[PDB]
Amino acid sequence: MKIARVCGTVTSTQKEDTLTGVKFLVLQYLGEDGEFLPDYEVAADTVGAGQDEWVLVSRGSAARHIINGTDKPIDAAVVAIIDTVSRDNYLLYSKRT
Amino acid sequence: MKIARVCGTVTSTQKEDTLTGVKFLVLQYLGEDGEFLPDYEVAADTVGAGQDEWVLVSRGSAARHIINGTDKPIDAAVVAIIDTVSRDNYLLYS
Amino acid sequence: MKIARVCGTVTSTQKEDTLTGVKFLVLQYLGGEFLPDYEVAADTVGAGQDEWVLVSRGSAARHIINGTDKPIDAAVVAIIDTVSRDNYLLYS
Amino acid sequence: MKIARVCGTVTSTQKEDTLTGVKFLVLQYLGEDGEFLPDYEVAADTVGAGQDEWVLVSRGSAARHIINGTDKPIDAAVVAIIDTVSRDNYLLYSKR
Amino acid sequence: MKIARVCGTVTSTQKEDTLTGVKFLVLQYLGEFLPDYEVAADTVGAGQDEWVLVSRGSAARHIINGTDKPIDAAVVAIIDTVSRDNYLLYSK
Numbered sequence: 001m002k003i004a005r006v007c008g009t010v011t012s013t014q015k016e017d018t019l020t021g022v023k024f025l026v027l028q029y030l031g032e033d034g035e036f037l038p039d040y041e042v043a044a045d046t047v048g049a050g051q052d053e054w055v056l057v058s059r060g061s062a063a064r065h066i067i068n069g070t071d072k073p074i075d076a077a078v079v080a081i082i083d084t085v086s087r088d089n090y091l092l093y094s095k096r097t
Numbered sequence: 098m099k100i101a102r103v104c105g106t107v108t109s110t111q112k113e114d115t116l117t118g119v120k121f122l123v124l125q126y127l128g129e130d131g132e133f134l135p136d137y138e139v140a141a142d143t144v145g146a147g148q149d150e151w152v153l154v155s156r157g158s159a160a161r162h163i164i165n166g167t168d169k170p171i172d173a174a175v176v177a178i179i180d181t182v183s184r185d186n187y188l189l190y191s
Numbered sequence: 192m193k194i195a196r197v198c199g200t201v202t203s204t205q206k207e208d209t210l211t212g213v214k215f216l217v218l219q220y221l222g223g224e225f226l227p228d229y230e231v232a233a234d235t236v237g238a239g240q241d242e243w244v245l246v247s248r249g250s251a252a253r254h255i256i257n258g259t260d261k262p263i264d265a266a267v268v269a270i271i272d273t274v275s276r277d278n279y280l281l282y283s
Numbered sequence: 284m285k286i287a288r289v290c291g292t293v294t295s296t297q298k299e300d301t302l303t304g305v306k307f308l309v310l311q312y313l314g315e316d317g318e319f320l321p322d323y324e325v326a327a328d329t330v331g332a333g334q335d336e337w338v339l340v341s342r343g344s345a346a347r348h349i350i351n352g353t354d355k356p357i358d359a360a361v362v363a364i365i366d367t368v369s370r371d372n373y374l375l376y377s378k379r
Numbered sequence: 380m381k382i383a384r385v386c387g388t389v390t391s392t393q394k395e396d397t398l399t400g401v402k403f404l405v406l407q408y409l410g411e412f413l414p415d416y417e418v419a420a421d422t423v424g425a426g427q428d429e430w431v432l433v434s435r436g437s438a439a440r441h442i443i444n445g446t447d448k449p450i451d452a453a454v455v456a457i458i459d460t461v462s463r464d465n466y467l468l469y470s471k
Contacts, residue, residue, distance in 0.1 A: 007185050075155040079299045169251075171251055202460045207455045339394075339403065349395055350395065
């Protein structure tokens with residue numbers, strides 16, 4: 001999985017029937033030391049991730065194993081909203097509780 | 098999924114038999130700050146996307162889960178036509 | 192899928208019993224020009240030297256005819272007649 | 284698979300209920316010459332890897348075949364803690 | 380599939396139980412070699428410096444008895460020959 005931040009949304013009306021009701025988040029990947037990387041992923045979200053929150057994103061067939069994702073033609077999804085990130089036992093990020 | 102713009106088409110007669118009737122679109126991947134990369138993809142379209150339109154492209158086995166995609170040897174598919182893209186509360190595309 | 196041209200072949204006598212009969216093509220990826228990355232791929236469609244092909248990668252490749260339960264990562268799934276960008280042809 | 288080193292953790296209390304109990308490790312991928320890259324991956328661990336330990340990480344559907352991983356939406360897993368890595372007759376890593 | 384050569388080995392004792400017996404080879408991808416490596420399961424019995432086809436993703440589990448093995452890379456063939464644009468790039 002990869003760490004990213006929620007940076008936006010994608011909207012559509014003309015799409016695969018299987019994607020009705022699917023909320024599309026734009027994600028910006030985060031690199032070393034929280035770096036805002038020039039790289040993004042449109043991902044489905046069934047967790048409830050807010051703008052600017054840090055998330056874990058899974059890509060490939062894993063996306064289809066989110067709740068109700070089985071028949072969905074999606075290759076990226078939010079599977080967790082990050083509460084904490086740490087390196088060598090020291091905190092570098094925390095979420096608003 | 099990636100954001101991409103429809104830029105062309107691919108046709109073929111000599112092909113795996115399961116691909117009969119599958120429309121192929123040439124797609125161009127969106128880079129950064131509204132720019133499109135010199136990277137392309139060829140994807141199946143069961144949504145009905147056209148030239149210059151923006152779309153969501155899903156890759157891998159996801160493609161086989163489009164309408165009639167079962168057991169087709171395709172690793173890329175248009176799954177949505179995009180109406181709007183916001184990033185950091187700025188309406189990048191509409 | 193990606194666009195490529197058939198540039199060569201690969202042979203092996205020491206291999207998974209599952210790859211029996213499988214022919215191995217070498218593909219050179221295209222960018223309207225061609226490019227330095229290679230893919231080794233299966234083919235049943237009859238793609239020959241210099242022909243333009245569409246290559247599908249990952250589990251898709253096992254969905255070619257007789258591809259079931261073959262440990263193959265990539266396959267030619269079509270030979271290309273035309274490729275149009277906007278209002279012109281990069282290739283026919 | 285890729286070789287990587289364990290260099291941290293991620294925690295989440297709001298997530299897919301399938302992932303309950305899932306230990307998340309932050310991994311750092313080996314580049315060349317014994318030197319690690321600034322590319323990172325968050326992977327599930329059922330092997331019990333710890334800080335600074337070298338590991339083999341498998342990605343994609345492979346990650347769901349770890350013990351108990353069947354229907355988990357995970358695309359990266361630690362599948363082995365490394366004892367040695369060779370590149371010839373030399374020894375890029377030894378746990379010892 | 381990717382052309383690589385075998386440049387080393389990885390051993391482990393604490394690991395997923397399904398991987399008992401699995402030999403791990405270090406590979407370096409491809410007319411000469413890149414800084415990019417991969418570690419892969421070997422059931423064909425490849426050796427140091429030999430060229431090989433590596434298959435990645437779910438393909439790796441369609442090797443002999445790989446069904447429930449958490450592996451995403453596998454040596455599926457030892458290469459005897461590689462040909463490119465009417466010219467021979469590799470053989471022994």
